[PDB]
Amino acid sequence: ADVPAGVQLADKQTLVRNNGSEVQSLDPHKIEGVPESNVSRDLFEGLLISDVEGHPSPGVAEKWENKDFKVWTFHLRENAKWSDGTPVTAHDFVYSWQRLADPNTASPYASYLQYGHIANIDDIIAGKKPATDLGVKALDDHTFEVTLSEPVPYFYKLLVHPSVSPVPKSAVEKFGDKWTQPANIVTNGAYKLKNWVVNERIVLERNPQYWDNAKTVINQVTYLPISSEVTDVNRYRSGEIDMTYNNMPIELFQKLKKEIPNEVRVDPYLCTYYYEINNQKAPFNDVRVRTALKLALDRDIIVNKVKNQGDLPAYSYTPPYTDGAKLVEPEWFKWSQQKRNEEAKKLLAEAGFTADKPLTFDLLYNTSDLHKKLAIAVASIWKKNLGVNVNLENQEWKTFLDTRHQGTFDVARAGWCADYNEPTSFLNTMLSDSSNNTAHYKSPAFDKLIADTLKVADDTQRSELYAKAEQQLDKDSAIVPVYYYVNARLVKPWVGGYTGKDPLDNIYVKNLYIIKH
Ligand SMILES: [U]
Ligand SMILES: [U]
Ligand SMILES: [U]
Ligand SMILES: [U]
Ligand SMILES: [U]
Ligand SMILES: [U]
Ligand SMILES: [U]
Ligand SMILES: [U]
């Protein structure tokens, strides 16, 4: 943390953050969500990290160079250490990225190494070459060298993500699945795990071996797993929570902006809220059904009337303000809602649905007051605009993500937040073989458009290709875009260091500080 001259620090430097739900895991290779990544940034540090404004900056790597955007060499700081005092080396990264690539690990982020195009990843994922063939090597204890199969100019931007953080081989090997328990875990970020009580709290304590420990200010941070946004706000306003999670309650938000304006932080965020359609399951493998659902949803009602928190109606998967995004708005988005509804009803009548044999299916969402309120509105809108019946179903976060990976679903509430600010952080997730492809969407045409983006060495051609990839997605109605998020949360006046300037919201508690109050 960089505490401003003249600010007074509180005697006690402790922080309580709500984190939305119980994490899937603390293992960097078994996670894919925001709540998971919130805790991972405090415990595990990769080659680069985001600075307080979100720019990719030195992490374990203090400096790096690239040869033709294909061979990247990272010079690791001599004093990077794990929490047991042993050195963080380039061999740690070698073992780590191989473990990420290995199909036996089953990471939901195995494909992150495809997105960066590390050499031999496709074969490794396919079981054809062992994970040891991956294009990574330690040229020495403090030098990590990555070889890609094509030039990727934005490659380093990917490296702040938890899936490319190191994991400690000895704890992993020795304790297997229990390596992340507090008595076993070893970490290299600014914090260490102190306590982990499932469905109660996660408590982290400063890691004194962290290389930048002298600038760390908060000695302890607790992450809570509260999925009720109302409860989160209540415990924030009672004094227990210093920073809510960034899901705000429909019940209280308008009142909060009028009551504690200075505390309600609202900033740009690179995430899209949509309904994920299970593209491989009838009748959702029919484009007319997906197009109907997409068109009959009234974004104006949902965004402006039912939510009303500053979100923007969405017509694409990649947020239009992502760096490099130059998207074309489909004509349906400028049509009337009435005109959307007729087209929709027309398509469903064409797909064979009547009044007598209507379309009925499940709407799966992760336990939350906000998602429940939004699914109820969407269910009534779909019912009135299109005659479809939906059965709402909630599942705890971890179970919800697993259900979507398994494909044991019809439609699900969904939200993707960028991992790096470039259109492929979204688009690569709809690739046929992506491990992040929970829409279970498979389009040869869509895959070819994205593969083409690294064949050209031009950014204009590249943006035009991302634009057409978004048009292929929309044409197929792979999803139902609903709105582009804003990052809205409550933060106490004594919490310093949070700018709200990072559109990825990659917060590190090592950057925060408690002002005396
Ligand atoms: U004190
Ligand atoms: U650049
Ligand atoms: U940029
Ligand atoms: U269903
Ligand atoms: U509620
Ligand atoms: U470039
Ligand atoms: U106080
Ligand atoms: U106090």
Coil, helix or strand at residue 76? strand
Cβ partners under 8 Å of residue 453, min gap 6 = 424, 462, 465, 466
Q: How far is the CA of 281 from the centre of ligand 4 (A)?
A: 10
Pairing of strands 71-76, 61-67: antiparallel
Q: How far is the CA of 13 from the centre of ligand 8 (A)?
A: 11
Handedness of CA 111, 324, 303, 493 (dihedral sign): positive
Q: How far is the CA of 322 from the centre of ligand 3 (A)?
A: 9
Host H or E run for residue 366: strand 360-366
Pairing of strands 14-18, 48-50: unpaired
What Å distances lie between residue 428 and 159, 354, 469, 470, 479, CA to CA?
Answer: 16, 37, 10, 11, 15
- Calpha distance 213→211 (Å, rounded): 6
Please check whether residues 214 and 127 belong to one and the same domain: no
Please check whether residues 307 and 351 belong to one and the same domain: yes
Say which DSSP state 302 is in.
I
Coil, helix or strand at residue 175? helix
CA dihedral 167, 171, 173, 175 (to 10 degrees): -130
Contact at 8 Å (CB) between 15 and 222? yes
Reading the block at residue 332, the tokens are 């349906």
User: Count of domains in the chain?
Assistant: 3
Query: Could you tell me which of 490, 493, 496 has the C-alpha nearest to residue 13?
Result: 496
Q: How far is the CA of 206 from the centre of ligand 8 (A)?
A: 21
Which numbered ligand comes closest to the C-alpha of 56?
3
Contact at 8 Å (CB) between 420 and 325? no
Q: How was this structure determined?
A: X-ray
The string of DSSP codes covering 385-418 is: HH--EEEEEEE-HHHHHHHHHHT--SEEEEEEE-
- Calpha distance 184→207 (Å, rounded): 15
**b vs e for 170-185, b when ≥16 Cβ sit within 10 Å of the residue's Cβ?**
ebbeeeeeebbeeeeb
Reading the block at residue 317, the tokens are 């998967």
Q: How far is the CA of 469 from the centre of ligand 7 (A)?
A: 55
Please check whether residues 392 and 360 belong to one and the same domain: yes
Reading the block at residue 314, the tokens are 């969405």
> Exposed, middle or buried by CB within 10 Å (0-12, 13-18, 19+), for 42?
buried
Please check whether residues 241 and 188 belong to one and the same domain: yes
Contact at 8 Å (CB) between 397 and 22? yes
Contact at 8 Å (CB) between 134 and 118? yes
CATH number at residue 30: 3.40.190.10
- Calpha distance 89→81 (Å, rounded): 8
Q: How far is the CA of 233 from the centre of ligand 1 (A)?
A: 27
According to DSSP, the residues that pair with 9 across neighbouring strands are: 515
Resolution in A: 2.0
Host H or E run for residue 49: strand 48-50
Cβ neighbour number for residue 369 with a 10 Å cutoff: 20
Please check whether residues 351 and 468 belong to one and the same domain: yes
Please check whether residues 458 and 407 belong to one and the same domain: yes
Reading the block at residue 134, the tokens are 């991956």
Q: How far is the CA of 186 from the centre of ligand 1 (A)?
A: 32
Q: Which of 145, 168, 191 is the last residue of a domain?
A: 168
Host H or E run for residue 37: helix 34-43
Cβ neighbour number for residue 299 with a 10 Å cutoff: 20
Contact at 8 Å (CB) between 392 and 313? no
Query: Could you tell me which of 226, 102, 301, 192 has the C-alpha nearest to residue 489?
Result: 226
Q: Which of 168, 186, 217 is the last residue of a domain?
A: 168
Strands (E), 110-263: 136-140, 143-147, 191-197, 201-206, 220-224
Pairing of strands 312-313, 479-490: antiparallel
Coil, helix or strand at residue 324? coil
Phi, psi (rounded to 5 degrees) for 388? -100, 145
CA dihedral 465, 108, 268, 4 (to 10 degrees): -130
Contact at 8 Å (CB) between 416 and 410? no
Coil, helix or strand at residue 290? helix
CATH number at residue 73: 3.90.76.10
Contact at 8 Å (CB) between 385 and 341? yes
> Exposed, middle or buried by CB within 10 Å (0-12, 13-18, 19+), for 197?
exposed
CA dihedral 307, 310, 315, 316 (to 10 degrees): -110
- Calpha distance 241→15 (Å, rounded): 8
Coil, helix or strand at residue 489? strand
According to DSSP, the residues that pair with 312 across neighbouring strands are: 484
- Calpha distance 378→488 (Å, rounded): 22
Coil, helix or strand at residue 223? strand
Please check whether residues 188 and 320 belong to one and the same domain: no
- Calpha distance 73→166 (Å, rounded): 16
- N- to C-terminal Cα distance for the chain? 18
Q: Give residue 365's Cα distance to chain centre.
A: 16
Please check whether residues 459 and 375 belong to one and the same domain: yes
CATH number at residue 448: 3.10.105.10
Q: Calculate helix-pair angle for 369-386, 287-296, nearest 10 degrees.
A: 110
Please check whether residues 368 and 478 belong to one and the same domain: yes
Q: How far is the CA of 512 from the centre of ligand 1 (A)?
A: 19
Which numbered ligand comes closest to the C-alpha of 11?
1
**How much helix, strand and coil, in percent to the nearest 5, is found in the chain?**
35, 20, 45
What Å distances lie between residue 31 and 97, 499, 516, CA to CA?
Answer: 14, 26, 36
Please check whether residues 191 and 330 belong to one and the same domain: no
Residue type, 210: Y
Reading the block at residue 93, the tokens are 């990264």
Domain that holds residue 467: 271-486
Contact at 8 Å (CB) between 167 and 44? yes
Q: Which of 127, 149, 168 is the last residue of a domain?
A: 168
- Calpha distance 101→128 (Å, rounded): 12
- Calpha distance 235→164 (Å, rounded): 34
Cα angle 380, 245, 31; round to 5: 90
Please check whether residues 56 and 163 belong to one and the same domain: yes
Residue listed under structure tokens 């310093």: 496
Q: Which residues surround ligand 4, an ion (CB under 5 A)?
A: 362, 410
Contact at 8 Å (CB) between 21 and 35? yes
Tell me how long the chain is: 517
- Calpha distance 465→456 (Å, rounded): 10
Which numbered ligand comes closest to the C-alpha of 456?
6
Q: How far is the CA of 430 from the centre of ligand 6 (A)?
A: 24
Please check whether residues 111 and 40 belong to one and the same domain: no
CA dihedral 489, 490, 493, 496 (to 10 degrees): -30
- Calpha distance 476→437 (Å, rounded): 15
Residue listed under structure tokens 């109660």: 200
Cα angle 169, 172, 178; round to 5: 160
Q: How far is the CA of 44 from the centre of ligand 5 (A)?
A: 35
